Amino acid sequence: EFQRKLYKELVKNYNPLERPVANDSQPLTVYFSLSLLQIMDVDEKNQVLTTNIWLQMSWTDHYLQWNVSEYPGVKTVRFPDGQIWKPDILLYNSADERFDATFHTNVLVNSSGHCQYLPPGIFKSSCYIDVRWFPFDVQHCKLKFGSWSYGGWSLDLQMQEADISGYIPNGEWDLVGIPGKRSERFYECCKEPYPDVTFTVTMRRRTLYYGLNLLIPCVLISALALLVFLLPADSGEKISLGITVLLSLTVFMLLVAEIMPATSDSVPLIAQYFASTMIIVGLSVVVTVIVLQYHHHDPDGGKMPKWTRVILLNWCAWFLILEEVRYIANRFRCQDESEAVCSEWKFAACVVDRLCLMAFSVFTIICTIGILMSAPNFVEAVSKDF
Amino acid sequence: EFQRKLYKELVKNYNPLERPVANDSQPLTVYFSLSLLQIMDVDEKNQVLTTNIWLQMSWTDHYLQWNVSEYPGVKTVRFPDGQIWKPDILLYNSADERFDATFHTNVLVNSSGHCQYLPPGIFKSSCYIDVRWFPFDVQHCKLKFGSWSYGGWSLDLQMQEADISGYIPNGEWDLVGIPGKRSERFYECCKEPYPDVTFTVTMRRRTLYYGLNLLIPCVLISALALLVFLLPADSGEKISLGITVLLSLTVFMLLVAEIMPATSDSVPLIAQYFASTMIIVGLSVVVTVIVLQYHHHDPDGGKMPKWTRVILLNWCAWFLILEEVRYIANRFRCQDESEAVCSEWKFAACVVDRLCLMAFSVFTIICTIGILMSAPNFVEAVSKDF
Amino acid sequence: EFQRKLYKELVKNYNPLERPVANDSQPLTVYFSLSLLQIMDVDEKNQVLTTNIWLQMSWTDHYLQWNVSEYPGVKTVRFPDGQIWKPDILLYNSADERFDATFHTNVLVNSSGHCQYLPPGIFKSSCYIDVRWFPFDVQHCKLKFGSWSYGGWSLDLQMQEADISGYIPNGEWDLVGIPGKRSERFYECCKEPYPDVTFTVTMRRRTLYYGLNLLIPCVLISALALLVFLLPADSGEKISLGITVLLSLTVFMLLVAEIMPATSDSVPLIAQYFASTMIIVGLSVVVTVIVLQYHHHDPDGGKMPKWTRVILLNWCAWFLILEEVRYIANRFRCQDESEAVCSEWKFAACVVDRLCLMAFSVFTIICTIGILMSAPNFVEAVSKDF
Amino acid sequence: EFQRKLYKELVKNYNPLERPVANDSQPLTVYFSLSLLQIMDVDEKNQVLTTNIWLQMSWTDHYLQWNVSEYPGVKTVRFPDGQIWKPDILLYNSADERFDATFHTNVLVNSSGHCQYLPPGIFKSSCYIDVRWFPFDVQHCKLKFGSWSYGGWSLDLQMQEADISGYIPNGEWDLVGIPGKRSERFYECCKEPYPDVTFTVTMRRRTLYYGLNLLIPCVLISALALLVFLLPADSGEKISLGITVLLSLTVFMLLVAEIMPATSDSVPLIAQYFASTMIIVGLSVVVTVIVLQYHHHDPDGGKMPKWTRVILLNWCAWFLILEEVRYIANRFRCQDESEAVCSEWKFAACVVDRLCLMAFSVFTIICTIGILMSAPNFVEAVSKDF
Amino acid sequence: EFQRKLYKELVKNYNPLERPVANDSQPLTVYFSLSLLQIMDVDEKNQVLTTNIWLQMSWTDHYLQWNVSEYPGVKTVRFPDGQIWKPDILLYNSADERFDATFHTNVLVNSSGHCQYLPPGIFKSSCYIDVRWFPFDVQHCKLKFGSWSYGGWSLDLQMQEADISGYIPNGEWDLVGIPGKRSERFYECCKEPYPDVTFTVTMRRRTLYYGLNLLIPCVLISALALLVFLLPADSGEKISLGITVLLSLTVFMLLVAEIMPATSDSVPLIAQYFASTMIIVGLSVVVTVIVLQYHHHDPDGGKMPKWTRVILLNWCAWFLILEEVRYIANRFRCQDESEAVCSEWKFAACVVDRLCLMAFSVFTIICTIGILMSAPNFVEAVSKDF
Ligand SMILES: *[C@@H]1O[C@H](CO)[C@@H](O)[C@H](O)[C@H]1NC(C)=O
Ligand SMILES: *[C@@H]1O[C@H](CO)[C@@H](O)[C@H](O)[C@H]1NC(C)=O
Ligand SMILES: *[C@@H]1O[C@H](CO)[C@@H](O)[C@H](O)[C@H]1NC(C)=O
Ligand SMILES: Clc1ccc([C@H]2C[C@@H]3CC[C@H]2N3)cn1
Ligand SMILES: Clc1ccc([C@H]2C[C@@H]3CC[C@H]2N3)cn1
Ligand SMILES: Clc1ccc([C@H]2C[C@@H]3CC[C@H]2N3)cn1
Ligand SMILES: Clc1ccc([C@H]2C[C@@H]3CC[C@H]2N3)cn1
Ligand SMILES: Clc1ccc([C@H]2C[C@@H]3CC[C@H]2N3)cn1
Ligand SMILES: [Ca+2]
Ligand SMILES: [Ca+2]
Ligand SMILES: [Ca+2]
Ligand SMILES: [Ca+2]
Ligand SMILES: [Ca+2]
């Protein structure tokens, strides 16, 4: 009864286009806040963050004011999208391909005129993904909200801290925080400042999954590569193992690239270490192969080039019936002679391959300690996850 | 005729914004229920549940009341979305990217004013997927329904048990149940309690498909690994078989990861067993390779390091014309001597590889019995499916 | 002219919510039919059928009746979605994620009041896919159409046979038929029966493509496996060929799984045969490997275990200067002795591998004849396609 | 000014449902044409053609007629979707899953009443893809446009030739033509003929990309297979090369299948040649393997079966101290005897493998000349592209 | 207050269809500009550019003019989509499949009547991708904006330079510029010129990512191929390494093809070099195989064909008790003779393989220098990125 009379009374001359202020010269104060419920996805490939959030717009409507005594039993009313004025607040850095993911809901109003609007949304935002310290990386993905057509002189957009009380842990990501910042900016379009509220979702990646799925294979690859660098040139399977380890490493680099963006602002350290040890082992497999097929015939066949020889040699010095039996026995002695000789090529391949092992060791230690001493602390993270 | 007169009469002063209650101070009772028709998909990768469901809202409209005698032959009327009042009930934990998948249908009303609303929907919900006990896992995926803008003081949302009479078995999933729970909650947004109805789809996975597609290959891999651990170091194909089994196991781990989420709250036991036996076999292939190329030349070459030797040895003890023929015959005797010797390295690789087999056996038994004695009972499940 | 006057006359007091019947107590007869134009897709993975169809609703509107003499030259009128009454007929088992794929078109009306409505649609329906007899399988995919809010007492939904005159052959599927069935059902929701019309698209798969793409490789794999089972244990490449055939077979099983659902109600016979011959060949490769590395040293080394020996043996029985030359000549005779011996292990591996070949042959014949004598007759199908 | 007065005047009694003709008994002439801008995609997998096109509807509105002198300065007016009458012309064979991709734009009208309507669209159409002559194939993909509810007695849909002046070459496809055909048809639905306009996009594929990406590998595979067929049975790597070439060929067949539909109306010649040479090389690898492990022991071991022997033989005929040295010398002579023998199996494998090479050559020549003499001429196409 | 009175006053007789000009004979000047915020994606496969942009339409409405003194405190008003006139400006070369990605926002108006409209959008445009100079390529992707139904006589569409002040670097692409061009064009549809504004996004690709992910493997492949060409025919692993390098190269070519379009207007130089060195190494592996199995038996077996022999030879010339011991010793001498011979086939394979290495070197140098001296300068680009 009184609800019907009130709804009829309020919409007599109401104009949804009108900014609801008694003084048209004064701006309208809008308290905009956010409630994060769940981080639904982080597409590092497309640099997209898919979140579930409830916005919170609170403002005052000078015309929607009634007296509870006049209308007993009704302390609230609801007004849908087009029946009253709502701020045109939206997400600037949206990637939704509709550019507005809000599900328009009812606006709740009470006698004093305080209007609440909590539109939910599956918001897809564009946030820059940093993979320099992968996979022990923290991402600061931004959500920039603001009014499109209402400026500071017409809409004083204030900020209230974001709400994470209802947040549901994702499992693959850990929500460090979601701080907000209200900033006043000017654009090369318009003479009025347009305030914005930027909420910076700061979240840290969880590494147990990638610790047992990815890093264990990686340590296996490293150990196999060290094993390859330990086998001598004459080893039968040192060339085969090098080749096989190469192909596995390459496949696994492609795996890393599948889930990582093509942005050139930085390179995943894991992939950089991959490529490094990759060139190192490939160079070692190639050197062993050139030593085994070109230097084999001559004890000083690979030493003919002036440069190759002097390099290796000086650098190593610095760094360290009767006649019948006659014929057959002579030929057998020649066989024995031809079967049991090694020359400076075995020693050279051992030196070169030892140098390759040393180069590989310089890279493993440096990368391991560097990833340990990363801005997203690795020691503390593993202490937490292990 | 009378239908036209009735439709004209009912919408005289009706306001769809008005909550239809004679006493505006009293809340409106809404009986919300659900009818599950088919589980359409379970994207474990994105942790999404795609279901087909018919909602069931039943309430009372004080203004839509007629007398059948006055309007003979019309016991019902239908009102579409915007012509009368419907509750703003929706799915909180939605992932639809429209955030409302309901197809708005007609509201059915009878003379007493009892209004029915059964909007169908392809609902995409966010539910946490537990893969700890994969693939013998049960999932409790939640569907949280509630009114967005109407609170307990305005909408007493009651719950009626869900309906599965029309449910169609998926084939890959078995519907254990769909119990409901009505809860009253407060939010850091608003001073009124907002009741919700949470239906917990509890469903168990079917394993015949994964029993013959996945587990049979797994047992094959395990048997091949045991075979690898049984072959001696001198075996020609023990190093090749280890490598090949490694690559197959890795591929198959990647297969598991393709269909499993990256959540770090737990690890699939199948994948954990993969990684375990993987490191075990790789360590065994590596040990055989170091024994075959570094220890080969010297009978006590690998025994030079103090630590390696003492470990193996003490632990094993605790755990257990004439002159022409002269020359040629002497050299042939030397050949015979050089061709028929084995040393402590064969025994050490047998001990080490035997220890690797023992470690692999400790893991196989433990994991097999553990998966047998899982909270989602495995013995009963196989009894059902086999 | 007269068209304008007629359009003005008809919408004087028309109410689209009103069911257009002179007697409100009587139901309205709606003849619902279907016209299938093209089967666009069959996603066996998600069990979805994507079709192009034109619905056909024919009914009678008591209020849209004019006299052609009064309005010469106008025998028809068109009314869009919201201007007049249309039945709320829709597809129950829809998977569209809008749950209504109809493109709302104009309703055609003639002087007698007979209204036609032929909304086209790309309908996505959920139909259970049976892969038991893959790839010689027929699918009965259902399309259940019905009114959502109008029951039998208000809407007598009759069925007219479906129209395939304009159907376009898909090429991968053959349309055996599309019979219809009108059924009256009750639901745990409502006191009125709600009739439905179910059209059962019965279509058979075409196998020429899969006959030359898939089955030819399969027969190749089978022949290679038989070849593996024919080679003796001492064969150099019998262990390598077994391993390679294994990996190829596994890859090809994964190919089958890529296009097949994970439903556990049945298993593709092709995949079952895969897994069978897979375990058989793997067991044979494993047996040859255990015979070649453990039994090699001793002529009765594998015969030490009591059980292994008795099994093989009894089952086979049921189933079937001078002194210098002295030294060197003696050692050469010892070499000759050591170089030219085979023992009961060659015979045992031949017996065991022969038994593996017999097991493989029992499965090939049984599966080939079974697939020949399938409910979707294979002999007639190949006669048609070959 | 005059524009406002004109817009007010025209919509006085206008009814968008009314067909705008002075004589309601006469049909309305609609000139429908098309402007193709870009072929955006050809999904051969789903048999879908994605095009960018501007429709062109031109007709006459008897009621939208003004006098320029009465309204100076306004020679045109614009009317959006629902303000005036537009024909319900749409694409019958659409695959858009909205079934109408037109972006509704303004209708342009001039004093004589001539109305223009040029709605743009990303049209997805279903067109049958012929891969028989792949990749030198031409596709005739149809676009069938027509009015849904207006028939010949009410809408005389004329055709004007399509416009390609603004067309942008795709690069992967060459637009041979886009001829149109206006046809009058009847349906098993309705008593009135419903004319249609069918534009047949006839386009030819470009093969430089597939000439250097695909065909070069193919010729490599063919040469490797010929090499395999040239190596003798005793060749060490003839069995390995055959196996490796097999696996590569299979992978590359799967590549062809990835981009080709599963339609069984025809088979890609490239894939047919693949499968042919595949069975040929596999049969040759298998024959060499049976000759190398079963016939090896006995010079007439493979000649025991009556059938195998007679076949090969007749068909080939039609087609073409002292005693110490005694012992040791005798055994060495036996070694020499056992080391240097070949028998009828080498000759038989050469004959059989030569026959396999001949079968492979019969197929290569036949397929190469056939693809040369294809309905989509290959010689002229390569002359153009090379 | 005054805002309400103003909003009521302005919409008294306003017609959104009316072009807002005092003189209907004169055209309306519309200043159209653009603000690029972020390049979201470049799908080279489908030749699509996904951008985030804010349009900027500025024009004048003769009817929306008020006096600030009459309405104090209100200097601006906002009008949504359908309440006033907006130009029908859209993107001609759109690929959105809705063909309009603009999110319709409010139109801002001030007392003088100057109307601003800044609709944001995720615009998907079709732009031709040039991969000739991959990956050091620059793309000129066009955005053609224009009015659909308003021509030059009615809409003088002027251009203002695009705004990149708020642009966010993508990371994978570098924004060289976004120049604009206003052009007047006629169409085979209409008698009036329809001006357009074309903004040409000129952007350069970043190569650090592809420099360490892609090019490093490529140089590895090249070095391995050179190594293959250095090994002699008798090398044991020269045939295996060639085969393995072949398969890796092919896989990596497929990787290039995965991210590259099938357009035949040009070929990626990287892929062309792939195919070249691929045929070269395959020809070398094939030649070594024919030399090793057909020429082996006879020292002049491959020299029998007249052509093969003369080619190689002339081109190379231009380019450069007692009797017992008797028997056994004689047979041993025959063994020695048979074991230590090479013939003109080793020299011929060295010559041929040397020629293959020379052909490979002619291609490596030519392609490396050509890519260095590309229109998108490579030396400067690497100087920037390295
Ligand atoms: C509210 O309305 C009641 C009843 O009309 C009246 O007595 C009271 O004065 C009003 N209060 C205010 C603050 O206007
Ligand atoms: C219903 O209407 C009939 C006819 O007007 C009247 O006789 C009867 O009293 C009414 N019943 C009620 C319960 O109002
Ligand atoms: C604006 O309005 C004020 C107040 O009515 C009036 O005094 C003044 O002359 C007006 N100015 C113009 C330029 O019309
Ligand atoms: Cl009508 C209008 C005026 C200004 C604007 C823009 C200024 C800031 C940046 C985007 C939006 N808010 C957009 N529309
Ligand atoms: Cl106007 C309004 C008031 C309250 C709410 C919220 C309170 C609970 C949680 C989501 C929704 N229901 C949302 N909108
Ligand atoms: Cl208002 C209303 C009443 C009944 C129904 C349901 C009964 C049958 C099954 C689905 C639909 N038709 C749906 N809505
Ligand atoms: Cl109301 C009505 C009448 C007829 C038709 C159909 C007849 C032809 C084929 C499709 C459409 N045009 C569709 N709707
Ligand atoms: Cl009503 C009408 C008239 C003309 C046009 C076209 C002419 C130019 C090219 C596309 C569009 N602008 C489109 N619609
Ligand atoms: Ca991710
Ligand atoms: Ca799944
Ligand atoms: Ca399919
Ligand atoms: Ca394609
Ligand atoms: Ca890209």
Q: With an 8 Å Cβ cutoff, is B234 touching chain A?
A: no
Assess whether chains C and B touch, using the rule of 3 or more C-beta pairs within 8 angstroms.
yes
> In the structure, which protein residues have their CB atom closer than 6 angstroms to any atom of ligand 7?
C 108, 116, 118; D 148-149, 187, 189-190, 194
Q: What CATH number did the domain enclosing E159 receive?
A: 2.70.170.10
Give the tokens for residue C125: 């329906």
Select from A366, A380, A8, A39 the least CA-distant residue to A202. Answer: A39
Q: Assess contact for E10 and E63: CB atoms under 8 A.
A: yes
Q: Which-ligand-closest: CA of A65?
A: 1
The Cα E236–Cα E251 span in angstroms is 24
Q: Which-ligand-closest: CA of A91?
A: 4
List all residues 6 or more positions away from E265 whose beta carbon is below 8 Å from its beta carbon.
D169, D171, E130
Count of CA atoms in the C-beta half-sphere (13 A) of E356: 28
CB nearest to D171's CB, from E154, E265, E324: E265
Residue D61 backbone dihedrals phi, psi, to 5 degrees: -110, 115
Pocket test for ligand 6, best of C93, C94, C149, C197 (most atoms within 8 A of CB): C149
Residue A246: is it exposed, middle or buried by C-beta count within 10 angstroms (0-12/13-18/19+)?
buried
The Cα B312–Cα B352 span in angstroms is 8
The Cα D292–Cα C235 span in angstroms is 9
Q: How determined?
A: cryo-EM
Question: Ligand 3 atom 3: the closest Cα is on which residue?
Answer: E69
Q: How many CB atoms lie within 10 A of CB C15?
A: 17
SS (H, E, C) D217-269: HHHHHHHHHHHHHHCCCCCCCHHHHHHHHHHHHHHHHHHHHHCCCCCCCCCCH
Helical segments of E148-202, H only: none
- Is D294 in Cβ contact with C223 (below 8 Å)? no
Output the DSSP codes for A211-250: IIIIIHHHHHHHHHHHHHHHS-TT-TTHHHHHHHHHHHHH
Q: Which residues of B touch A77 (CB under 8 A)?
A: 17
Say yes or no: CB of residue B70 within 6 Å of ligand 2. Answer: yes
List all residues 6 or more positions away from A340 whose beta carbon is below 8 Å from its beta carbon.
none
Find the E262 Cα to ligand 12 centroid distance in Å: 8
Q: With an 8 Å Cβ cutoff, is E307 touching chain D?
A: no
CA A24 to chain E, closest CA, distance in angstroms equals 5
Select from A221, A222, A228 the least CA-distant residue to A242. Answer: A228
The Cα E335–Cα A116 span in angstroms is 102
Helical segments of D135-236, H only: 208-210, 216-230
- Alpha carbon distances (Å) from A373 to A136, A268, A366, A368, A377: 11, 15, 10, 9, 6
Q: With an 8 Å Cβ cutoff, is D324 touching chain E?
A: no
Partner B, chain A 167-186, Cβ-Cβ below 8 Å:
168, 170-172
**Residue C168 DSSP label:** B
Select from E157, E164, E180, E59 the least CA-distant residue to E113. Answer: E59
Q: Assess contact for A108 and A84: CB atoms under 8 A.
A: no
Stated length of chain C: 386
Select from A118, A115, A193, A114 the least CA-distant residue to A150. Answer: A193
For chain A, report the end-to-end CA distance as a whole number of angstroms. Answer: 64
The Cα E21–Cα C117 span in angstroms is 44
Owning domain of residue D201: 1-207
Give the tokens for residue B146: 């509630």
Q: Which residues of E touch D329 (CB under 8 A)?
A: 324, 327-328
Residue E35 backbone dihedrals phi, psi, to 5 degrees: -135, 110
Residue whose structure tokens are 């909007």: B119
The Cα C121–Cα C76 span in angstroms is 24
- Is A148 in Cβ contact with E105 (below 8 Å)? yes
* Helix pair angle (C269-293, C238-258), 10° resolution: 160
The Cα A52–Cα A99 span in angstroms is 15
Pocket test for ligand 2, best of B6, B67, B111, B112 (most atoms within 8 A of CB): B67
Pocket test for ligand 3, best of E66, E70, E74 (most atoms within 8 A of CB): E70
Long-range contacts, stretch A305-312, CB < 8 angstroms, 24+ apart = A312/A348, A312/A351, A312/A352
Q: Which-ligand-closest: CA of B139?
A: 10
Nearest Cα residue in chain A from B85: A78
Residue whose structure tokens are 């195998």: D308
The Cα A327–Cα E330 span in angstroms is 10
Select from E126, E19, E138 the least CA-distant residue to E378. Answer: E138
Give the tokens for residue A251: 């496949």
The Cα C36–Cα C163 span in angstroms is 6
Nearest Cα residue in chain D from E255: D213
The Cα D284–Cα D357 span in angstroms is 9
Strands C196-205 and B180-183: unpaired
The β-bridge partners of E106 are: none
Give the tokens for residue A121: 């949304």
The Cα D198–Cα D180 span in angstroms is 6
Assess whether chains E and A touch, using the rule of 3 or more C-beta pairs within 8 angstroms.
yes
A199-220 burial: b if 16+ Cβ within 10 Å, else e: bbbbbbbbbbbbbbbbebbbeb
Count of CA atoms in the C-beta half-sphere (13 A) of B92: 23
Q: Assess contact for B288 and B349: CB atoms under 8 A.
A: yes
The β-bridge partners of E180 are: E199
- Is E1 in Cβ contact with A22 (below 8 Å)? yes
CB nearest to D95's CB, from C3, C118, C122: C122
Long-range contacts, stretch A373-382, CB < 8 angstroms, 24+ apart = A374/A133, A374/A136, A375/A133, A376/A133, A376/A136, A376/A137, A376/A138, A376/A204, A378/A136, A381/A136, A381/A204, A381/A207, A382/A207, A382/A211
Q: Which-ligand-closest: CA of B49?
A: 10
The Cα C44–Cα C55 span in angstroms is 25
Q: Which residues of C touch B96 (CB under 8 A)?
A: 97
Output the DSSP codes for D20-51: --SSTTSPEEEEEEEEEEEEEEEETTTTEEEE
User: Helix and strand tally (H, E) in chain B?
Assistant: 9, 12
Torsion sign, CA atoms A281, A286, A292, A297: negative
Give the tokens for residue C90: 């829709």
Nearest Cα residue in chain A from E160: A189
Residue whose structure tokens are 């905009």: A32
Q: Assess contact for E3 and A27: CB atoms under 8 A.
A: no
3-state secondary structure of C349: helix
* Helix pair angle (E322-339, A322-339), 10° resolution: 30
Nearest Cα residue in chain D from E128: D170
Select from A198, A195, A193 the least CA-distant residue to A180. Answer: A198
Stated length of chain E: 386
Select from C33, C260, C58 the least CA-distant residue to C143. Answer: C33
Question: Ligand 1 atom 5: the closest Cα is on which residue?
Answer: A70
Give the tokens for residue E300: 């002049």
* Helix pair angle (C378-385, C344-372), 10° resolution: 80
Question: Ligand 4 atom 3: the closest Cα is on which residue?
Answer: A149
Q: Which residues of B are annotated as a binding site for Ca(2+)?
A: 19, 21, 149, 187
Give the tokens for residue E295: 């020429």
Give the tokens for residue D177: 């033509």
Q: Which residues of E touch D99 (CB under 8 A)?
A: none
H or E element in which residue C315 lies: helix C306-319
List all residues 6 or more positions away from B141 whose beta carbon is below 8 Å from its beta carbon.
B42, B49, B125, B127, B128, B200, B201, B203
